[PDB]
Amino acid sequence: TGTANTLFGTASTGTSLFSSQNNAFAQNKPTGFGNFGTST
Amino acid sequence: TGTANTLFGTASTGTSLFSSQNNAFAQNKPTGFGNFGTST
Amino acid sequence: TGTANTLFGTASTGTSLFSSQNNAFAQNKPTGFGNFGTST
Amino acid sequence: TGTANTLFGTASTGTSLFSSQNNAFAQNKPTGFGNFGTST
Amino acid sequence: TGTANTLFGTASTGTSLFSSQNNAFAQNKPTGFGNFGTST
Amino acid sequence: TGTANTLFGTASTGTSLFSSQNNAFAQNKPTGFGNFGTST
Amino acid sequence: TGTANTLFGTASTGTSLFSSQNNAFAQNKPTGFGNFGTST
Amino acid sequence: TGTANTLFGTASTGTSLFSSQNNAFAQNKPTGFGNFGTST
Amino acid sequence: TGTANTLFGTASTGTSLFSSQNNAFAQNKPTGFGNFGTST
Amino acid sequence: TGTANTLFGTASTGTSLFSSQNNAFAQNKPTGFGNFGTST
Amino acid sequence: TGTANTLFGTASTGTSLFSSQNNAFAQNKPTGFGNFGTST
Amino acid sequence: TGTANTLFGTASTGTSLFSSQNNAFAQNKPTGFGNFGTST
Amino acid sequence: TGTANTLFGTASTGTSLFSSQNNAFAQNKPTGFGNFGTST
Amino acid sequence: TGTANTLFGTASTGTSLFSSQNNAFAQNKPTGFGNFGTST
Amino acid sequence: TGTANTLFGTASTGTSLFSSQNNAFAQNKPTGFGNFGTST
Amino acid sequence: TGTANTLFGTASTGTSLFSSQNNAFAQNKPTGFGNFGTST
Amino acid sequence: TGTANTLFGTASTGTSLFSSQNNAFAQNKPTGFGNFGTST
Amino acid sequence: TGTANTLFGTASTGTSLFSSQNNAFAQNKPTGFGNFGTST
Amino acid sequence: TGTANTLFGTASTGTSLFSSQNNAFAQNKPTGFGNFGTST
Amino acid sequence: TGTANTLFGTASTGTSLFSSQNNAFAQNKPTGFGNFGTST
Amino acid sequence: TGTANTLFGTASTGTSLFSSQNNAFAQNKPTGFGNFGTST
Amino acid sequence: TGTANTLFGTASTGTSLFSSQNNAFAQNKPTGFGNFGTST
Fold it and tell me: Which chains contact K through at least 3 pairs of Cβ atoms less than 8 Å apart?
């Protein structure tokens, strides 16, 4: 109720859950994440 | 209820879940993610 | 209820789920993602 | 009720859950996360 | 009730849960997390 | 009631729960966490 | 009632729960945590 | 009622609970925790 | 009623509970904890 | 009523509870704890 | 009523409860505890 | 029931049911009256 | 019930049910009257 | 009930039910009248 | 009931039920009238 | 009941129920009238 | 009841119930009228 | 009841119930009328 | 009752109930009318 | 009752009940009318 | 009753009840009308 | 009653009840009308 981010990760190897949230009445350039070199 | 991002990742190897959320009344250039070099 | 992004990733190798969301009353150039070098 | 981020991680190996939340009436460039070198 | 971040970690090996929360009426560049070298 | 961060860690090996919370009427660059070298 | 951080740690090996909380009317650069070399 | 941090630690081996709390009307750079070399 | 930090530690081996609390009207750089070499 | 820190430690081996509390109208750099070499 | 720190220690082996409290109208660098070499 | 008034998000007033489950690697072996995994 | 008034998020007024479960590796073996995993 | 007035978050007024459970590796063996894992 | 007035967070006025449980490795063996894990 | 007035956090006025339990490795063996783990 | 007026935290006025329990390794063996672990 | 006026913390005016218990390794063996672990 | 006026901490005016118990390794064996561990 | 006026700590005016008990290794064996461990 | 005026600590004016007990290794064996350990 | 005026400590004006007891290894064996350990 709000931003509910769960993770379960059963019998896993290498699991992660990243979350960002930038709330404002005014916000100059809010990033969530930086640059990615390699993905997946 | 809101932004609900779950991950389950069963018997997995290398699982991730990235989320960004930039809410404002005014926001100059909100990125979510940077540049990707390689994907998948 | 809202933006619900789940991932399951069963017996997987290399799974990811990226999400961006830029809500505003006014937003100059909101990107979601940067440049991709290679995809898939 | 609010941002509820749980993790369960059953029989797992290498599980993590990162969360950021930048609330303001005004915020110049709030990041959530820095640059990623490799992902997943 | 507020930001409730629980973790359960049953029979696990290597589990973590990181959370940041930067509330203000005004905040110049609030990060949540620094740069990541490798993820997952 | 407020930010309630519990951890249960049953039969676990290597479990941790990090939490930061920077509340202010005004705060120049409040980080939550520093740079990460390796994650998960 | 306030920030209630409990930990249970049943039959565990290596469990920890870190919490920071920096409340102010004004605070220049309040960190919660320093740099992490390795995580999880 | 206030910040209530309990720990139970049943049949455990290596359990800890760290908490910091820096309240002020004004506080220049209040950290909670220093740098971490290895985590979990 | 105030900051109530209890620990129970039943049948345990190696249990600890650290707490800091720096209240002021003004406080230059109040840390709670120093640097950590290894955690968990 | 105030900061009530109890410990119970039943059938335990190696239990401790550390608490600091630095109240002031003004306090330059009040630490609670020094550097930790190894934790948990 | 005030800071009430009790310990019960039933059938225990190695139990301790450390408490510090530095109240002032003005106090330059009040520590509570020194450096820790190993913890838990 | 009452009205629901959102700009940027779900204004549900009806019987809104979300479910995410995983029944991965799960084996239902009933001789009689078995139901497994009913996510409505 | 009463009205719900959000700008940026779920204004639910109805019977809103969220569920996330995992039934991974779970084995239901009833002879009679077994239900397993009913996430509504 | 009464109205609910949010800018940036869930203004629930209805019967809002959140659940997260894991039934991983869990084995229900009833001869009669067994229900396991009912997350509404 | 009374109204609820938030800017940045859940203004619940209804019957808000949160639950997180884990039933991992848990084995329900009733001959009659067994329910296990009912998280509403 | 009375109104609830928050800027940055949950203004609950309704019947708000939070629960976190773990029923891990727990074995319910009733012959008759057994309920185990009812987290509402 | 009376109003509740917070800037940065939960202004609960309703019947707010928090619970955290662990029923780990716990075995309910009733012949008749057994309930175990009811965390509301 | 009377009003509650906080800046940085829980202004509860309602029936606020917190509970933390552990029922770990605990075995309820009633023949009749047994309830174990009721944390409201 | 009277009003409660805090800046940095819980201003409870209602029926605030905190409980922490442990029922670890505890065995309830009633033939009739047994309740064990009722932490409200 | 009278008002309560704190800057840095709990200004309770209501019926504030704290309890910590341990019922570890404790065995309730009533034939009739036994209650054990009622921590309100 | 009269007002309570603290800067740094609990200004209780209500019925404030603290209790800490341990019922460890304690065995209640009533045939009729036994209550053991009632910590309010 | 009269007012209570503290800077650094509990200004209780209400019915403040503290109790610490231990009922360890204690065995209540009433046939009728036994109460043991009532710490209010």
Answer: H, I, J, T, U, V
